[model samples]
Target: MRRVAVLGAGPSGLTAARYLKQAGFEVMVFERYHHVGGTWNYTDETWMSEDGRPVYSSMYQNLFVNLPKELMAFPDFPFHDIEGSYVPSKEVLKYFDNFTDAFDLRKLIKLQHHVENVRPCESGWLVTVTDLTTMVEHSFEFDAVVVCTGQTWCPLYPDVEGRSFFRGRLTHAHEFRSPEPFRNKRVLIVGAGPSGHDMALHISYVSKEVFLSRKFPDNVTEKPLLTSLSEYTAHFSDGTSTDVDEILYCTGYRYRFPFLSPECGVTVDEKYVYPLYLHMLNINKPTMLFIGVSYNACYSIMFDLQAQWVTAVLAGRCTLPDAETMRKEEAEYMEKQRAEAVHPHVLMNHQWEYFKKLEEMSGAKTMPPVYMKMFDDVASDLVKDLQNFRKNNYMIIDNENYKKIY
Candidate 1:
């Protein structure tokens, strides 16, 4: 069995290890946090309820989850249908905890252990792992290394002028614990998205006057947290009676991997994901692949299917074509996404497009005989997810909206 090491214990990381382990590989996970659940888990300092109830005191209360519960679930493991979109951040953490519990994914996690470096060693990698608790490092050899560290850990503060001169407790949304202190205070939120709106609403109950700097949506029930235009569509409160105490930003995240060298594998321009003939394997090296990083669709299972397809290729379970040929096709699709201004922007649907390409690239006659990928082929599967999310989390006043940009 090939020995594998997965970094981080989040959805992407857990899924990677679970699939690799079940595929007859020996898998182990290295996580830097004491808790197995990465961003989902909370503490008294992290989360708080409206009635001054501490949701997790320190790094907790200001948190929010952007995805609906169902779409965020893994195959054979998910929140009950009773729990819809707007799944509380705490509950999402529990959902992930249960996923690991059901699949026994926790067994593979090396909690509080950090991966120092992944250097090339002949055919695979030489991993240096550090124990966060003890500050001791160890060396290990693995046939493969999957870096599942998510994009949220490094919070990128916007470059604003004189941010340090602000005369208040200036903290990222990550630091705000409760809306209690914002009571009777004037708040100005900076960015627009789920967290931005959620904070505005939460602080509304307590703060005196909230001046939402971003576009205030007269209605935002159907709108998602992250979008190209949501910034301009935001309108705060039902009639201007609410107070805003804290400044929040729902600006989207920047996908990056500072640790990985640019030349070690394929590289794209400013775009986060490179153009692969199919979104599965690299057009340059079939051995190289990317997983768990698509947007604008069923993120959970999409990553799962992509990983399965990659495993099939690496294990000789499936056949694929030359890298150059696939690269050309991928480049064309990427151009289409760019034309639509989605791919890395407004509404990225790369995974959906990748599915079709993978089948063609692998030369597979049909979709995966497995239950996971087949769910993707259902005519209304994606539509159902979209409608469900729109129900709890969006707003649409279909007016005679004519495009008069000129």
Candidate 2:
């Protein structure tokens, strides 16, 4: 039997492990933390681990799953009949615990094990890992490696003039655990992404004033681009200035793989991982599969389909196109994205189409048509009412229908 090393115990890693093991491969999952939940494992401490690695979870207190539970669960394991559509992070962790127990995934997982390097070798691949408890390094050989280490771990900071000299408190959204620290203070939040929008509303309740700085102004109290910073003051491109007590950077993360050696041929440029076919498989080395890389989709469903595709390929049930063909397709897809000025990884309006493509390519179990309908409904609702969106609940009526109830 072929052996596969899965480098994470997160949702993607767990799904990959389940599919790979069920397909008769020797599967081993490695998790840096001692828990099964990946980003859902909430922690108040934002400091580095004992081994000096950044905290794994970026979850904040009072953070709710942006997607409803019905849509967030793995396709194979439906969530138990829950009352609310949206659940908190703790409930998500509980769901993950149930998933781990139901699938017997914990037995295949090695906790507190950190993967240091993944290098290609004649015998498939050599994986080097460091045990956090003993600090002893060990190397293992596997027939293939699926990189499920997600992209949100490494925080990306923008280069702003006078940022270092600014006297106000500055923190990344990754380190933001709660809003209690900014009580009654004038806060400047950078970037208006989902996190930025949520945080601006969250802190606005307690802060003396909240200024959201982004390229375009929205419904929130928006400000133009921050040109510079001074001691206790922020200068905007509109020649306006504000006396801010704190600056919170809601800037997103980088697609980082510090463990992969240079020979692995995985390069991330401008938030895009190159040489990837269908944003999952590496064209240079098909054995080096990167799951859960794309964003702005039904994350759980996307990961499940990607895992099934990888499993099919490894089990010899699915065949991939040649390297040249894959490269051409990737280039054409990226070119289309470039033309539309969309991020190569953002699958926003094209998520359902992407899912259909994956289903066609791997011949995996077909996703229910209701999922796409519910996703589209939620996406529209979220834009119309960001604050009141979660107040809406949904029920899947059938394969291609759903109803929003209360």
Candidate 3:
């Protein structure tokens, strides 16, 4: 049996480990936190801990999942009779916990263990981890390493030239726990993505006013990131300016793998994670793969299919092309993305091809009829209404269709 080390015990990590175990691989899971759920296991603190420990979670205090509950379930396991489609953050955490309980996954998990480094050896890959409880570091040899550490751990703050001179409070949305501090203060939220919209709406009730700054979505103020800034004065891209009490960057995260080195043949930057065949396996080192890399899609289903595909490759159920061929294809895709001026990380509908590719290779069940369409529809509607969108109800008409009642 091949020995596999799965990093992180979040949804992707848990799914990967479960499938790898059933596929008969010896699976060991290392989680930084004391429990499962990763980011779903929410914490009030933002950023890393004060003592140099890492805090990988980014959940805010009043956040609910944007997608519906039925669409969020794993293929092998369905959520048992959850009442509504829109679920709260705690309920999502419970869903992950339920998966753990159903599979008896706790025994295979080493909780409170932090992965230090992963590098290829002559035989396979060597994984170094620090046991948080004891602060002891140890190395283990594995046939493969599935990186489920996810992209949300590192905050991708914008690199504006004059941002440092601003005297008002500035923070990333990742560090935002609640709007209690912004009570009665004018707030400026940069980037109108899911988190930005949520933050804008969350603080709107009490804040004096919210200035939602966005480059896209002409409906909102079409302002670029703040350029010239004074203590309370700000300038935007559209040649307009505003004054606010605080600035919250909902700018998203970077692809960070502090443990992996440049020699690992995997290049991760703000734009793209390079040379990963199908955005999963490292073309040069197929032994290491990343799960849950895609964004703006149904995550539970996406992660499940990706995990299944990874295990299939590891179990000999799926075959990869030669490294040279894989590299060529990866280069072509990267070039295409670059030509389109698409950021490497922005995979919205663009990920449809990727999902289909993995599903065919893994031979897993097809996504539920309403899965993709509903995710796409709701995501669009959230553009219409982010705050009250959850109030909409949904019914699965059959395996292929759904009806939404507003």
lDDT values of the candidates?
0.55, 0.85, 0.81
lDDT of 2 by residue, 6-52 (tens): 99998899889888988989998989898987999987768586566
Query: All predictions: root-mean-square deviation over Cα?
Result: 9.5, 2.1, 2.5
What tens digits encode model 3's per-residue C-alpha lDDT throughout 22-63? 888889999988879988877876677643577899888877
User: Which residue runs does candidate 1 get wrong by more than 4 Å?
Assistant: 44-59, 62-68, 78-87, 157-170, 215-246, 266-288, 343-406
Clashes of each: 37, 0, 0
Candidate 1 on 66-95: residue-level lDDT in tens?
Answer: 544544665456475543455567777777
Minimum summed lDDT over a 10-residue window in model 2 is located at: 215-224
Question: What ranking emerges by TM-score with the best candidate at the front?
Answer: 2, 3, 1
| TM-scores, one per candidate | 0.69, 0.95, 0.94
Best by lDDT: 2
TM-score of 3: 0.94
In candidate 3, position 357 carries an lDDT of 81
Top candidate on TM-score is 2
Candidate 2 displacement at residue 192 in angstroms: 1.3
Q: Best to worst by lDDT, what's the order?
A: 2, 3, 1
Scanning candidate 3 in windows of ten residues, the lowest lDDT window is: 216-225
Clashing residue pairs in candidate 3 (N, C-alpha, C atoms within 3 angstroms):
none
